Every structure is written in C-alpha cells, then in structure tokens.
Design a protein around this ligand. Structure first.
Ligand SMILES: Nc1nc2c(ncn2[C@@H]2O[C@H](COP(=O)(O)OP(=O)(O)O)[C@@H](O)[C@H]2O)c(=O)[nH]1
Ligand SMILES: [Mn+2]
Ligand SMILES: [Mn+2]
Ligand code: NA
Length: 612
C-alpha cells in the first residue's frame, strides 16, 4: 500500500512489469528503486532485439564504437582510472573477521579483506542513496550455469550501466526464461551502480561513467548480496564474473558441500578414442585460456573447451567429481592473443564480441601487443586512449588488462557437453604458475592430501614471486584455512573418486632468460603424460616433490633438443628455500586455521628434501 505515490514504481517501468516478477524479486527491485531513485526501470528479457537496440543506443551516446571489419563487434574505451579490478576496494562482510580471513600470526592478511557490518552500512549510505537519478535501472535476471542444472544458481543484477547489460548477456544466461525458472526460489541479490547520478557533479571522461574514489565492491554472504559501487569495469561490474562465481559461490559451496574454483575445464581425447576431463587452476596471466582452447600439436589428440575461468564441482552419488562452467562466454585478456599462441580464440572473437580498451585499426579492426599479425601498408592504429599510435612509440596501444567478451558457443572447439546440466566428470586437477626457476615442467602429487598441499603452496611471478594458493588468493569467499579443510574433507566422502592432482610449470627459464619449454600447443605432450598417469601407466619416477615423468616417458618427437635435464632438474638448494618460504607463509597467513594434514604434508616434504 501507500499513503501517497512514492512506493509503487510501476509507472517508471519501460520494459516488462513489476507484477510479473516473483514477490521477492519485486521487493528487491522496488526497495532499491526507492533508494537509488532511477528515472526508469527496464526488466531485461534477454532478446536479441533488446540487445541490438541497447548497442545502437550506446553507439549513438558515444559509449561504444562499432568495429566495422567484423560482424557485430564493438569497442569500449574506459576512463583510465577504471580499467581493472581493485583488490584494495574489494571486501567481504561478516559478523566475525575470522569467518572471512584467518587471523594472521604477525602480518596483514593477504587472503581477503574483511569489513565489519557497521563500517559497510556507513559506506553504503555514503554511496547509493539517489545514485541512479536520471538513469535507467536495468534488472538483469541471469543464471550461473545451464538453466535447470542442479549446479546452477540464479542472480538478479540491478545496474545503471547498459555496458554491463550487454556484457552480462554474453557472460551469463540472461532474460525472461530465468525469471520463469526462478519462481519463488532463492537468488543472489546483485546491486551495481557506476555512482554518477545526473546531473553530473564531476567531469565525465571518455563517455565512461565511474566514481573511482568511492569505488567499493562488497560481498555479504550471509545476506546473499553483492553490492558494488563506482566502477563500470568487468570484474567490478559483471557481478557474475568473480563476485558471484567465486566469492559468494565459494561460501555457498562450503555450506552445501561442493567446490567453486578458479579453474578451466577441458576435454581431451587420445588417439585410441578415450576422453577425459581435466580442471586447471592457474593465476591470471598464467595461461588458462591458452590451455582450455589449445590446438594440440600431437597427432590424433583433440582438446575441447568446457570453460576457461570458473568451475563449479560437486561429487555426485556415484562419487564422480562433476563440474560445470557456470559462465556463458569468455572474458579473456586480449594482449598476447595471437594466431600462433591461441588460434581458436582468434576465431572465437571475430563475431558478436565486445572489446574493451584495445586499439582500433583504421579499417575497423582490433589491435594489441602480442597480436603478431602484420597490418597492410596504409593501415593505422588508434590507441585505447583514443590517440594515434605507432609501433615504436613507448607505451602500449592496448591497455594490458584490456578484454574481449565473447559467446562461448562460438568457440570452434567448444566441448559438446559444455552445457550439460549434469556437468563433466573431472579425473585430473592441475595447478601451476609462472616459476622462472626450480619447479619442474610437471609433477604429480603423492596423495589427495599432498595434492591439496600442492594447491596451497602455489606461487607465481608477479620481479616478485607471490603466493596464490589454488589461484584463488583474490577470490576466497571465506577463511582459507576452512577452505583447505573443505578440500581435505572430500577424501572422507565414501565412493568419492578423487582426481589425480598435478602441478605444471610452462615458464621455467635457463640462465639466459629463455623459456626451456616451447609451451602452447606443445603442452599437449604434458597432457598426454597426465592422461596415461590417470589410466595407471607405469610412466612415473618418484622424487622428493612427487612423481615426475620417467626418462623417455614424455613424447618429445617433433621438438628440437629440449633440455630435459634442466627442465626436470630438482635442486636440494632451491627446494630447501621453497619449503622454508611455504612454511613461513602458511604459519603466518593461515595460523590457527591451518589443517593438521597440511602441516603434516609440509613436514613430510621438508623431510624428503633434507634426505636428498
Ligand atoms: N611461454 C608460455 N606462455 C604462455 C603459455 N600459455 C599462455 N602463455 C602466455 O600467458 C599469457 C596469458 O595467457 P592467458 O591464456 O590469458 O592466461 P589466463 O589469463 O590465465 O587465461 C599470454 O600472453 C600467453 O601468451 C605457455 O604455454 N607458454
Ligand atoms: Mn583467461
Ligand atoms: Mn583426512
Ligand atoms: Na568511451
């Protein structure tokens, strides 16, 4: 009801109907409509007409440009203050800090950023009241995962950014069918504003609304809410991409007994027609998308991509680890993508793709560092900062965090089961990062517990070697020690078919700084070794850090002389220091929440190293 005319926003609805929404969805929409005071409410239906009209509207506003060399491709250039996720402004809200991060023994936690409820209420009241004035509030009903999959979760994102609506349509399953499937069910509440009510108080830069000084990306897992303010960029604004898929989801998985992980999922078939599925957790810029879309060099082998970033995994009644890719598209870093490194990505992004902060060629194409493709004479390049640019000029034409956002169904090697609601059965989990020294090309963990220890000890080159356990350091939705305990607890489920755990290093370097391994499609040779190991082949040699390939077990035919002894060299001196460094890290950062079994694997590794 009402004593006046201010609580019913039905008169401001320019698409859809508040009556057609489920009761809780309406209360979420109307309550924040009253707080944000949008001029209009647009309930997205997800149709191609709605999407084409939004795009053309953004084109006429100057928000995006059409890339004329390609079919329905678009380019957005942001405010340079709003170009990436900002970890320092990304927070999780819980009653007790220890539920979100382990209390470190001596240092500041690197494993999350907690904010008290009181502090967040102040931050929220200082940001959102009236923040959508003069703007449309879009209501985005979206499903994370195949609609109706037992692994899927549903979200509702409110945003004043049409760029977000267009990118969410690619990255999620979006629209009227989600509302119908949701019904009276539960959903994650997603609230996003770029924080620039009209009339504008501050200059608009490059037609890109943002509010960098008030940017704050908050997660409230006990209220099932994500609340993000001031940034329009990717991971801050597509609330499915990381906030939902990893931070909220990891908390939900802990409560409900599954896993939400920063993992590609791929399907690999060998020359005998056997197919296995693998998940791989690499930190950003360590090659998940290359591996997931690999063009294998080994004859007779095939790789197919289920996902390149997020896996949700649940042991089913039969004990198989079933995984879905909860996303609907790829949000890949553009620079470094070349036909040589990732030809299947190049094919993917030529249609129906939104690019952000890359360079544009005079004939309407895209350009970026590492594209490794010559331009015809006469063709010129506009930088991502909307200025003319020459190859020898001393600044990148594309921002290093620039993106393509492209439908997954367009990948030429997308796996035929990539949308199966049952998911795919994972037989192998791979960890890895950039290590210039000391870590062999590949080794296999001795046990599930050692494998969990291996993920926990992951490190990766930034001149700095940083800790990034499970590749999830920016993304843990809760206490990392309890996360380790959660992973370990999988071994105690009866019937559980624990996957083999591997660790790879594509990036070992010789004394001149040259990569010892050619990588890319040649990684199909490492995958081949893992495939055989999962089948039980006797291809492994035991070492202090785990199993490595026997001499001549790796297929190195068609390669030059790869320096195998240095690529697989294991130095007592390096590993003494490595285990020392892991010890200090886990004791400091996980402290009282470190599982016993992890402390034990650490002791065991130290002891194996001491005897070599
Ligand atoms: N040397 C080497 N570099 C790689 C390999 N795979 C990927 N890269 C590089 O790592 C960078 C990031 O790759 P990407 O697939 O975006 O990693 P993601 O950000 O984890 O998906 C790219 O510039 C690649 O060229 C590899 O096997 N060997
Ligand atoms: Mn990627
Ligand atoms: Mn145990
Ligand atoms: Na712009």
């Amino acid at each position: 009801p009402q004593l006046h005319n201010g609580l019913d926003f039905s008169a401001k609805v320019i698409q859809g109907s508040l009556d057609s929404l489920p009761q809780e969805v309406r209360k979420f929409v109307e309550g924040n409509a009253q707080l944000c005071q949008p001029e209009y409410i647009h309930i997205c239906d997800g149709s191609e007409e709605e999407y084409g009209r939004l795009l053309a509207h953004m084109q006429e506003e100057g928000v995006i440009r059409k890339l004329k060399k390609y079919d329905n491709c678009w380019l957005a250039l942001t405010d340079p203050r709003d170009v990436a996720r900002i970890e320092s402004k990304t927070v999780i809200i819980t009653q007790e800090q220890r539920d979100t991060v382990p209390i470190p023994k001596s240092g500041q936690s690197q494993l999350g950023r907690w904010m008290s409820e009181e502090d967040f209420e102040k931050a929220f009241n200082a940001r959102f009241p009236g923040c959508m004035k003069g703007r449309t509030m879009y209501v985005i009903p979206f499903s994370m995962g195949p609609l109706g999959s037992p692994l899927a979760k549903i979200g509702i994102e409110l945003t004043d950014s049409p760029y977000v609506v267009a990118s969410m349509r690619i990255m999620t399953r979006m629209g009227t069918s989600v509302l119908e499937a949701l019904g009276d069910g539960e959903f994650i509440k997603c609230l996003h504003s770029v924080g620039c009510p009209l009339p504008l108080k501050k200059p608009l830069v490059n037609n890109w609304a943002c509010n960098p000084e008030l940017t704050l990306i908050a997660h409230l897992p006990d209220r099932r809410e994500i609340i993000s303010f001031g940034s329009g960029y990717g991971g801050n604004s597509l609330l499915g991409k990381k906030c939902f898929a990893l931070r909220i989801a990891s908390r939900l998985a802990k409560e409900e007994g599954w896993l939400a992980e920063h993992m590609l999922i791929l399907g690999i078939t060998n020359p005998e027609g056997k197919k296995k599925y693998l998940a791989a957790a690499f930190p950003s810029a360590c090659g998940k998308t290359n591996l997931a879309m690999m063009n294998p060099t080994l004859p007779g082998w095939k790789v197919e991509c289920v996902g390149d970033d997020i896996a949700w995994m649940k042991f089913d009644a039969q004990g198989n680890l079933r995984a879905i890719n909860p996303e609907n598209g790829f949000f890949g870093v553009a620079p470094g993508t070349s036909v040589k490194t990732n030809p299947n990505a190049i094919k993917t992004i030529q249609k129906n793709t939104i690019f952000t902060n890359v360079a544009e060629t005079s004939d309407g194409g895209v350009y970026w560092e590492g594209i490794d493709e010559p331009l015809a004479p006469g063709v010129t390049i506009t930088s991502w900062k909307n200025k003319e640019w020459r190859p020898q000029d001393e600044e990148p034409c594309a921002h290093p965090n620039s993106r393509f956002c492209t439908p997954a169904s367009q990948c030429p090697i997308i796996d035929p089961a990539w949308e199966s609601p049952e998911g795919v059965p994972i037989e192998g989990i791979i960890f890895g990062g950039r290590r210039p020294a000391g870590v062999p090309l590949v080794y296999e963990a001795l046990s599930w517990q050692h494998g969990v220890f291996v993920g926990a000890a992951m490190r990766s080159e930034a001149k700095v070697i940083m800790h990034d356990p499970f590749a999830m350091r920016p993304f843990f939705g809760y206490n990392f020690g309890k996360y380790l305990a959660h992973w370990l607890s999988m071994a105690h489920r009866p019937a559980a078919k624990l996957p083999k755990i591997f660790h790879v290093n594509w990036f070992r370097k010789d004394k001149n700084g040259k990569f010892l391994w050619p990588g890319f499609g040649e990684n199909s040779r490492v995958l081949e070794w893992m495939f055989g190991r999962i089948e039980g082949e006797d291809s492994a040699k035991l070492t202090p850090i785990g199993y490595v390939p026997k001499e001549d077990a790796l297929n190195l035919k068609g390669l030059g002389d790869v320096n195998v002894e240095e690529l697989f060299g294991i130095s007592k001196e390096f590993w003494e220091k490595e285990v020392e460094e892991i010890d200090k890290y886990l004791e400091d950062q996980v402290n009282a929440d470190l599982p016993y079994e992890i402390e034990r694997e650490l002791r065991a590794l130290k002891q194996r190293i001491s005897q070599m």
